[PDB]
Amino acid sequence: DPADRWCELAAWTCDTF
Amino acid sequence: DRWCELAAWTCDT
Amino acid sequence: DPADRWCELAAWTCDTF
Amino acid sequence: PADRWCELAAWTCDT
Amino acid sequence: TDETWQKLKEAVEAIQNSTSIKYNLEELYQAVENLCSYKISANLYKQLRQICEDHIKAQIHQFREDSLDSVLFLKKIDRCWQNHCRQMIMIRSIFLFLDRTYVLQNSMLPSIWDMGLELFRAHIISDQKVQNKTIDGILLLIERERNGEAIDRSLLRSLLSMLSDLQIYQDSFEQRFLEETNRLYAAEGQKLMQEREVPEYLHHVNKRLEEEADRLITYLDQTTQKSLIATVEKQLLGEHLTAILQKGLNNLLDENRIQDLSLLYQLFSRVRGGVQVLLQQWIEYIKAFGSTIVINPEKDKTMRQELDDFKDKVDHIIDICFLKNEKFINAMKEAFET
Amino acid sequence: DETWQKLKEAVEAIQNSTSIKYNLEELYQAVENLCSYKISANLYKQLRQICEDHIKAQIHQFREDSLDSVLFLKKIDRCWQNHCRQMIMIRSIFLFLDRTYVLQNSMLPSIWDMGLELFRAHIISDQKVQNKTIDGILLLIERERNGEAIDRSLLRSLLSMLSDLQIYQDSFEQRFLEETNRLYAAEGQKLMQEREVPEYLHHVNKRLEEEADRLITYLDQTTQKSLIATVEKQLLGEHLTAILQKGLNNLLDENRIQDLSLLYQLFSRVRGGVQVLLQQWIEYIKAFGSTIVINPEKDKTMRQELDDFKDKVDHIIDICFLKNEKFINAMKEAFETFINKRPN
Amino acid sequence: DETWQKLKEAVEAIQNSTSIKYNLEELYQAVENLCSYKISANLYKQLRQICEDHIKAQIHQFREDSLDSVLFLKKIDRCWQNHCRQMIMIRSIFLFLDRTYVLQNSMLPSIWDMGLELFRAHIISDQKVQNKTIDGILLLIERERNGEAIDRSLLRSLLSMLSDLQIYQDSFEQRFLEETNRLYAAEGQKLMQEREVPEYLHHVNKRLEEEADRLITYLDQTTQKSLIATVEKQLLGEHLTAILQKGLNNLLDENRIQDLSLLYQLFSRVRGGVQVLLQQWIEYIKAFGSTIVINPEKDKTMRQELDDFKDKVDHIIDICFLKNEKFINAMKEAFET
Amino acid sequence: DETWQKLKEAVEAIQNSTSIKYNLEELYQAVENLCSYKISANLYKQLRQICEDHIKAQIHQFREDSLDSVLFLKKIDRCWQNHCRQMIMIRSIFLFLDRTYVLQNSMLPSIWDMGLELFRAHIISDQKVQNKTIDGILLLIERERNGEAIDRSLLRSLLSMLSDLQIYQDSFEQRFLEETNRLYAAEGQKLMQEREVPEYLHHVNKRLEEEADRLITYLDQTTQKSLIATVEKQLLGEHLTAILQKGLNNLLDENRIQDLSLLYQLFSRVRGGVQVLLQQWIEYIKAFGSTIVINPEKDKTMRQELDDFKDKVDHIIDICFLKNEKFINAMKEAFETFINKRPN
Ligand SMILES: *CC(=O)Nc1ccc(NC(=O)C*)cc1
Ligand SMILES: *CC(=O)Nc1ccc(NC(=O)C*)cc1
Ligand SMILES: *CC(=O)Nc1ccc(NC(=O)C*)cc1
Ligand SMILES: *CC(=O)Nc1ccc(NC(=O)C*)cc1
C-alpha cells in the first residue's frame, strides 16, 4: 500500500512542477 | 405653575 | 573785521537753511 | 653643433 | 585616447547588462583619472552621458506591452527603477574622480547621479502613456486598499519614493490622488450618512482618519499630510456637521451615551466651526428639554429633583465628554436663565 | 533718554496687556534714532533686560505644588501663548533693530529667538516646572491609549512649544519612547496570552493605525521612525514565532483567507517577518507530505487529494500573500526534496 | 458686531501708524470670542478685506512717472518694511486665530502668508512696478561692478523681499545671470587686449573676490554656483589658450614665480585649465632644450646650463604648481624627445 | 553560507581594487536571497564586520606623524576618496539590503552612513590623526592669508569630509575662528600704524573680499556669519574712532570722494560705524564754521567760500554717503547751532 503512494507522489511532483 | 419653581432653581443654582 | 564775518554767516545760514 | 644632441640624450637617460 | 575609453565603455556596458567587469578596479579608476588630466578631444562626461542615454532609451519598450496587468506593469517600473539606481550608483563609484573634480572645479553640469535621474525622467517616466499607466495603477491600488483589498504597500512606497526622487510626486501623483480622495470620501460621506446611525457613523469616520493616517506613515510622502487629512475631515465631517446633530445628538443626549458623546467631541474638534456648531445645538437641546419639563413633567418625582437629576446628568457629560470645557458650562447657565 | 522711556512703557504695556499710550509712528521713530545716535548694543541689551525681568517674574505662578495636572498644563500653555503674542508685537515695534543686526552681521540672536532663550531658561528649564509638564504630557498620552478622551489640541500646543524651544528631544522624545516601549511590551505579552491569533492581529493593526493617528495629530514628525518601529517591535517582532506556532496551522487548515492576508500585511512591517512566515510555510507542506504517505483521507483517489491541496495553497499564495513567487518556489523545492528522502 | 468694530479701528491705527485706543487684553478678548460663537472662517475673511483695502491704496505712489530709480526702489523698500511691521503686529493680536487654523489643519494661509499674497498681488504683481523694480536692482549691481558706491543694505532688503515673495528666481535671478554674462564677456575680451597677462590675471582674481563679496552680502545663496561659473567662464575659460600664448613664455623666461603661482591658482578653477597649461609647459620645455643644443650659450659648460634650467624649472613645479606630479612627469617626457 | 562567500570576495575585490570575479547579476541574487531566507539582520552584521576589518587596517599608514604636513594631508585625502569610492560600490551591490531596511522602518544606519561611522571611529577620531589633520588644514589657511599658494582643492575636500563626518564644527570651526580672530586682531593693530587711512581702508576691503572668496571656495557656509563678523570687528570695529581722527578730516579737506565712498561702505558693516562717522562729520562742519569767521580770507568773498563749501559737502553726501538724510540734517543743525555760539 505505501509503495503505491510514493509512486503516485513522484508522478504528481513531476506533473505539477 | 411650574415657571415658578424653575426660576427659583435658576437663582439657587 | 570778525564781527562782519559772523554777520555774513548768519545771513548765509538763513538763506541756505 | 652635433656635440649637443649627444649631451642631451645622456642627460635624458641620467635624469 | 580611444583604447582607455573602451575600458570604461565596456565596464559601463557590463554594469548595464548585469554581466562581468573584466578589469581590476584600479585599472578603471586610473583610466578615469588619465582622461581627466590630459584633455584631448575629451569631455568624458558627454561620452558617459551618451552610453547612459542609449541604454535607458532601450528600457522604454517593456512598458508598451498591450493589455498587461496593472500590478505587473507597476512591478516592471519598479524593477526598471531599482536597476537604474543600482547601475548609476556603481558608475558613480568608478567615475568618482569625474564628478568630484567637476564639483571642485565648480561645474554647471549635473552630477552623474542627477544626470541619470534626468535621463530616467526624460526617456521613461516623461512618456505620457507610461506615466499615465503608472499613476493609474498606483491610484488603483490605493482605491483597492480603501475598499478593503490587500495590496503591496512596499511597492507603493518604492514607486512614490521614485516619483519624489524624480521630483514629480507633486505634479504627477499628489494632485490626482487628492482629487480621487476628495471624490471618494465625498461619496462615502453622503452614502453612509443615510445608511448608518450617528454612533455607527462616527466610529467609521474615526476609523478612516486612522487608516488615512496609516497610509501617510506607510507609503505616502510626508508633505501630503496637510492636504489629505483636511480632505477626509471635510468630506466625512465638515460637510455633515449640522446633519449629524439633527440626526443623532438628541438621541445621544436623551439616552446618555457617554462614549459616543466623547467621540463626537473629539471628531468635531478636528474641524473649523465644529465645536461651535455643536455648542449651538447644545443650547437648543437644553432649552427644548428644559422648557418641556416645566410644561410636561414625567410625573415620577417632584419638580425640584427631576431638575436636579437633569443637571447631574449634564454635568457628568461636560466633565468627561467635553473635557471640562468652560464654554459649555457657561452656555448651560445662560440657557437655564431663559 | 526720554526716547527709551517711551519704548520701556510700550513694552511694559504689551507685557501687562494694557494700553500703548503713544501712536506707533512715534514708537517706530524712537527705535531708529537709538540705533542712529547711540550704539545699538545699548538698546538690544536694554530690551533684553526688561524682557528678562518680566519673564523671570512668571515662574512664581507655578509654585502651588499641589493642583490638577491638566490645569497645570493649561497654565503652561497660556503662559506660552502670552509669551509668543507679547514677543511678536515687541518684535514688530523693534523691527528696524532686528533687521539692522542682520545688516551689521551680529552674532546676537534675533529678538524672537532672544525671547525664546529667556523663556526656556527662566520658565521651562526649571526642573520642577519641566518635570510636571512632561509628566502631565505623558500622562495625557497614557490616558488616550487606555481609551480615555483627552484634549489633543492642548497636547499639540505644548509639544509644539517644546519643539520651538529645541528641547523636544532631550525632555520628551526619549522618555516618551521609553514609556511607549514599556507599555506595548506588556500589552503585547498579555493579549498574546488572552486572545487568539485572529483577534490579536486585528488589535495590533488597530494600535498601529492609532499610533499613526497620534503621530499626525499632536506628535512631531521626527518621532515617526522611532515610534512606529517601537510598536512594531513590541506587538509583532517579539512574537513572530509565537504567533505562527499558535495560529498559522489553524489559519491554513481552516482556509481563513482574510486573517491570513492581515497576517501577511502585518508581518511585512517587521524585519524578518515574511521570512519567518516563509519557513513555517515550508514546514506546513513537508508536514502535509509526511501524512499523505501515511494517512490518505480515503474519500478521494490520492491524485485528487494532492490536487485539492495544491489549489487551496495556490489560492492562499495568490490572494493572502500577493502572488509572492518566493512562496511558489519554496513550495516546489519543498515537494521536490521531500520525494527524494523516500525509502529505497 | 460691536466687538468686531473694536479691531477694525485697531488694524487701521496700525496701518496709519497712529494710536491703539484700547487695552491689548480687550482686543485679545475680541478675537477669542468671535472665533467661538460662530465659525472662525468668518473673521479671517474680514481681516483680509481690510488688509486688501489698505494695500491696494499703496500702489498709487509708484505711478509718479519720470521718478529717479534709486528713489523708486527706496519707496518700494519703505512700502515693504511698513507692510511687514504692520502684518507682524496684526498677527500678534490675531494669534488665537492664526493657531486655531494651525491646530485643526486649515488650508487657509497663515496671516503672515495672507499678507504676503496681498503684497505680491497688489504691489509687485503690477508688471510696470515689478519691471521698474528689477531694472533698478540690476542697475545698482551694474553700477557697483563699474566701481560706484551703492546702498547694499537696500539691495539686500529688496532681494530678500523677492525671496520672501518667492519670485527671486523667476523675475530676478535669470536676468541677473544674463547681465553678468554679457558684462564679463565684454570685459574679458576688452582687458585681454588692453592689459598684459600679469595685470589681466590680477584683475581676474580681483573680480572673483568681488563677486564672492556680492554673493555673501546681498545675493541669495542659491545664485552662488551659477554666478561664479559665469565669471570663471567669461574671464578665464574663453581666454585660457589666448592667455598662455600671449604671456606664458614671458612669465617663464623671466622666472615670475608670484604671477606663475596665480596662473596655476586661477587655471585650477576651470575645466581643462591645468591641462592646457600642462600642454604649453611641455611645448616650452621642448622648445627651450632644443634651442640650447642647437644654439648654445657661452658662459660655462652646457651640461651645467642644462642644470640651472632644471633648478629653475623644478622650483616652479615646487611652488607655482604645488608639487604637481603631472608637471614633473611631463618635463621628463618632453626631454626624451 | 556559500552564497555569502561570493559577496565577501566581491567586497574584498572592491576594497583591494582588484577584479570582481563574478557577473553582477549573480551578486544581486546573493543579496536578494540572503534577505529573503536567512533574515536581513545577519547579512547586515556580516557586511559591517568585513567593512570594519578593512578600514581598521587603514590606521597603520598614519603612524608616522612626523611626516610633511601636506603629504600627510594628501595621504588623508587619498584614504578618504578610496573609502568613498569603495563604499559607494558596496552600496550598489547591497542596494536591496539598503532599500529593505528603509521600507521596514529600520533603526539601523544605512550602508553609506555605517561606512562613515567606521571611518570616523577608526581613522579621523584618532587623536594623533585628527590633530595632525586639523593642524595642517589651519596651517594651509594661514599660509594663504600670508600670500602663499596652496591647494584649495585639497582644502575643500578635507573640510567637506569633516562635514560629512559631522565633526567640522567641534574639531575645526571653533579653532578656525579663534585663529582668524588672533590673526586679524594683530593685523588690525599693526597695519593701522604702518599704513595711512586711504591705504588701510583698501586693505580692509581686500581682506573682506578675500575672506568671502575663501568661504565660497573651501569653507562651509555655516561659518559665514562668524567669520565675516570676526574680520569686520578686528579690522574695523576696534579701530573706528582711530581711523576717523587719523584720516577723516584730511579725506574731506582734499575731497577724496573714492576713499570717502569706501569709508562709508566699510563703516556701514559695523555697529556704530555710521554713527561715529556722523558725529565726526558734525565736528568737521563746526570746525569749518570756526575757521571761516577767524580768517579774513582774501581769495574769494565769504559768501563765495561758503557756497563752494556747500557744493563740495552736498556732493560728498550725495555720492559717498548715498544721499543719507541723517547727514543733511546734521549739517543743518551744525551751522544753525554754530551761529548761536556767536559772541555777544
Ligand atoms: C513507482 C515510481 O517510482 N513511479 C514514478 C512515477 C513518476 C515519476 N516521475 C518523474 O520522475 C518525473 C517517477 C517515478
Ligand atoms: C410664580 C413665579 O415664577 N415667582 C418667582 C419666580 C422666580 C423668582 N426668582 C428670583 O427672584 C431670583 C422670583 C419669583
Ligand atoms: C551783524 C548781524 O548780526 N547781521 C545779520 C545778518 C543776517 C541775519 N539773518 C538771519 O538771522 C536769518 C542775521 C544777522
Ligand atoms: C652622438 C651619440 O651617439 N650620443 C649618445 C648619447 C647618449 C647615449 N646613451 C644614453 O643617453 C643613455 C648614447 C649616445
- Decide: A7 in ligand 1 pocket, CB within 6 A: yes
User: Smallest CA–CA separation between H259 and chain C, in Å?
Assistant: 28
Nearest atom of ligand 3 to the alpha carbon of C8: 6
- Decide: B8 in ligand 2 pocket, CB within 6 A: yes
E246 three-class SS: helix
Nearest to E84 by CA among E116, E49, E128, E121: E116
Distance CA H229, CA F104 (A): 8
Residues E4 and E106 in one domain: yes
- Left, alpha or beta for H315 (phi > 0: left; psi -120 to 50: alpha)? alpha
Nearest atom of ligand 2 to the alpha carbon of B4: 3
Q: Which residue has the cell 503621530?
A: F215
With beta carbons under 8 A apart, name residues in chain F contacting H270.
104
CB-based contact F44:F97 (threshold 8 Å) = yes
User: Smallest CA–CA separation between E170 and chain F, in Å?
Assistant: 20
Distance CA E30, CA E25 (A): 8
Cα angle at G248 between G242 and G250, to 5 degrees?
120
Judged by CB atoms closer than 8 Å, whether chains meet at B5 and E307 is answered as yes
First to last CA, chain A: 25
Q: Tally Cβ neighbours within 10 Å of residue G32.
A: 13
Chain G residue nearest residue H261, CA to CA: G149
Distance CA G263, CA F252 (A): 78
Residues H259 and H293 in one domain: yes
H19 three-class SS: strand
Are G and C close enough to touch, i.e. 3+ CB pairs under 8 angstroms? Answer: no
Q: Tally Cβ neighbours within 10 Å of residue G36.
A: 15
Q: Which chains touch F (3 or more CB pairs under 8 A)?
A: A, E, G, H
How far is the centre of ligand 3, averaged over its atoms, from the C-alpha of C7 (Å)? 5
Grid cell at residue E150: 490587500
- Decide: D8 in ligand 4 pocket, CB within 6 A: no
Chain G residue nearest residue F157, CA to CA: G103
In a domain, F312, yes or no: yes
Distance CA F321, CA E151 (A): 9
Helix H24-37 × helix H69-93 angle, to 10°: 70
Distance CA G55, CA G129 (A): 14
Distance CA F342, CA A7 (A): 10
Q: Which residue has the cell 487684553?
A: G25
How far is the centre of ligand 3, averaged over its atoms, from the C-alpha of C4 (Å)? 10
What are the residue ranges of helices labelled H in chain H?
2-16, 24-37, 40-56, 69-93, 95-103, 111-119, 127-145, 152-164, 174-194, 197-217, 224-235, 240-253, 257-268, 273-292, 302-319, 325-338
Grid cell at residue F89: 508685537
- Measured between CB atoms, does E225 come within 8 Å of chain F? yes
With beta carbons under 8 A apart, name residues in chain B contacting E311.
13
Residues F285 and F249 in one domain: yes
Q: Whose CA is nearest to atom 6 of ligand 2?
A: B4
E270 three-class SS: coil
Beta-bridge partners for H19: E24
Distance CA F39, CA F45 (A): 11
Question: Across the interface, which of H39, H226, H274 has its CB nearest the CB of F107?
Answer: H226
Nearest to E322 by CA among E254, E255, E274: E274
Judged by CB atoms closer than 8 Å, whether chains meet at C9 and H289 is answered as yes
User: Smallest CA–CA separation between G277 and chain D, in Å?
Assistant: 23
CB-based contact G173:G220 (threshold 8 Å) = yes
Judged by CB atoms closer than 8 Å, whether chains meet at E311 and B3 is answered as no
- Measured between CB atoms, does E23 come within 8 Å of chain H? yes
Beta-bridge partners for H85: none
Distance CA E229, CA E273 (A): 16
Grid cell at residue G57: 491704496
The H or E element containing residue E329 is helix E326-336
F275 three-class SS: helix
- Decide: B6 in ligand 2 pocket, CB within 6 A: no
In a domain, H199, yes or no: yes
Q: Which residue has the cell 502670552?
A: F82
Are H and F close enough to touch, i.e. 3+ CB pairs under 8 angstroms? Answer: yes
E24 three-class SS: strand
Distance CA G195, CA G246 (A): 11
Burial (CB count within 10 angstroms: exposed 0-12, middle 13-18, buried 19+), residue G124: buried
Residues G168 and G146 in one domain: yes
Judged by CB atoms closer than 8 Å, whether chains meet at G268 and H322 is answered as no
Residues H114 and H128 in one domain: no
Distance CA F70, CA F82 (A): 18
> Which experimental approach was used here?
X-ray
- Measured between CB atoms, does E216 come within 8 Å of chain F? yes
Distance CA H283, CA H278 (A): 9
CB-based contact F142:E258 (threshold 8 Å) = no
E224, E240, E256: which is the final residue of a domain? Answer: E240
Q: Whose CA is nearest to atom 3 of ligand 1?
A: A7
With beta carbons under 8 A apart, name residues in chain G contacting D6.
none
Output phi, psi for G248, to 5 deg. -65, -45
How far is the centre of ligand 2, averaged over its atoms, from the C-alpha of B4 (Å)? 6
Residues E235 and E301 in one domain: no
Distance CA F293, CA F301 (A): 13
G92 three-class SS: helix
- Measured between CB atoms, does F274 come within 8 Å of chain H? yes
Instruction: Return the DSSP state at H23.
Output: -
How far is the centre of ligand 4, averaged over its atoms, from the C-alpha of G326 (Å)? 27
Question: Count of domains in chain F?
Answer: 3
Cα angle at H26 between H22 and H27, to 5 degrees?
80
**For the CA of C15, the nearest ligand:** 3
Q: Whose CA is nearest to atom 6 of ligand 4?
A: D6
Computed from CA positions of residues G181, G184, G188, G189, in that sequence, does the dihedral angle turn out positive or negative?
positive
Instruction: Return the DSSP state at G223.
Output: G
Amino acid in the structure at residue G110: S
CB-based contact H257:H316 (threshold 8 Å) = yes
H90, H122, H154: which is the final residue of a domain? Answer: H122
Q: Tally Cβ neighbours within 10 Å of residue E121.
A: 17
In three-state form (DSSP H/G/I as H, E/B as E, the rest C), the secondary structure along G31-87 is HHHHCCCCCHHHCHHHHHHHHHHHHHCCHHHHHCCCCCHHHHHHHHHHHHHHHHHHH
What are the residue ranges of helices labelled H in chain F?
2-16, 24-36, 40-56, 69-93, 95-103, 111-119, 127-145, 152-164, 174-194, 197-217, 224-235, 240-253, 257-267, 273-292, 303-319, 325-338
Distance CA E148, CA E136 (A): 18
In a domain, H343, yes or no: no
Nearest to E294 by CA among F231, E302, G53: E302
E220 three-class SS: coil
B8 three-class SS: helix
G106 three-class SS: coil
Domain that holds residue E207: 124-240
Residues G215 and G273 in one domain: no
E89, E123, E157: which is the final residue of a domain? Answer: E123
Pocket test for ligand 2, best of B3, B5, B12 (most atoms within 8 A of CB): B3
Judged by CB atoms closer than 8 Å, whether chains meet at H232 and F105 is answered as yes
H24 three-class SS: helix
In a domain, F328, yes or no: yes
Instruction: Return the DSSP state at H22.
Output: S
Distance CA G89, CA G13 (A): 11
Distance CA H340, CA E328 (A): 72
Distance CA G67, CA G273 (A): 47
User: Smallest CA–CA separation between G194 and chain F, in Å?
Assistant: 38
Nearest atom of ligand 4 to the alpha carbon of D2: 1
Residues E235 and E245 in one domain: no
Grid cell at residue F175: 522618555
Distance CA H158, CA H199 (A): 35
In a domain, F233, yes or no: yes
Q: How far is CA H54 from the centre of its chain?
A: 34
With beta carbons under 8 A apart, name residues in chain A contacting F289.
9
Instruction: Return the DSSP state at E110.
Output: P
With beta carbons under 8 A apart, name residues in chain C contacting H310.
16
Distance CA G182, CA G176 (A): 10
Distances in Å between the Cα of G68 and the Cα atoms of G79, G246, H317 are 16, 45, 17
Output phi, psi for H66, to 5 deg. -120, -10
The CATH number that applies at residue H248 is 1.20.1310.10
Q: Tally Cβ neighbours within 10 Å of residue E25.
A: 22
In three-state form (DSSP H/G/I as H, E/B as E, the rest C), the secondary structure along F123-153 is HHCCHHHHHHHHHHHHHHHHHHHCCCCCCHH
Residues G226 and G244 in one domain: no
Distance CA H293, CA C12 (A): 12
Residues G201 and G225 in one domain: yes
Distance CA H89, CA F279 (A): 32
| Residue F242 C-beta-side C-alpha neighbours within 13 Å | 16
CB-based contact E56:E120 (threshold 8 Å) = yes
Computed from CA positions of residues G114, G120, G125, G128, in that sequence, does the dihedral angle turn out positive or negative?
positive
Beta-bridge partners for E24: H19
Cα angle at E87 between E82 and E88, to 5 degrees?
100
- This structure's resolution (Å) is 2.9
CB-based contact E85:E95 (threshold 8 Å) = no
Computed from CA positions of residues H19, H22, H27, H28, in that sequence, does the dihedral angle turn out positive or negative?
positive
Distance CA C17, CA E331 (A): 68
Q: Tally Cβ neighbours within 10 Å of residue G69.
A: 15
In a domain, F265, yes or no: yes
* E175-207: b (≥16 Cβ within 10 Å) or e: eebeeebbebbeebbeebbeeeebbebbeebbe
Nearest atom of ligand 4 to the alpha carbon of D11: 11
Distance CA F274, CA F240 (A): 10
Residues G208 and G196 in one domain: yes
CB-based contact G105:E233 (threshold 8 Å) = yes
**For the CA of F340, the nearest ligand:** 1
Residues G143 and G233 in one domain: yes
Q: Which residue has the cell 578589469?
A: E23
Pocket test for ligand 1, best of A5, A13, A16, A17 (most atoms within 8 A of CB): A13
**For the CA of C8, the nearest ligand:** 3
Q: Whose CA is nearest to atom 5 of ligand 2?
A: B4
Distance CA G165, CA G135 (A): 18
Distance CA G122, CA H65 (A): 66
Radius of gyration of chain A (CA): 8
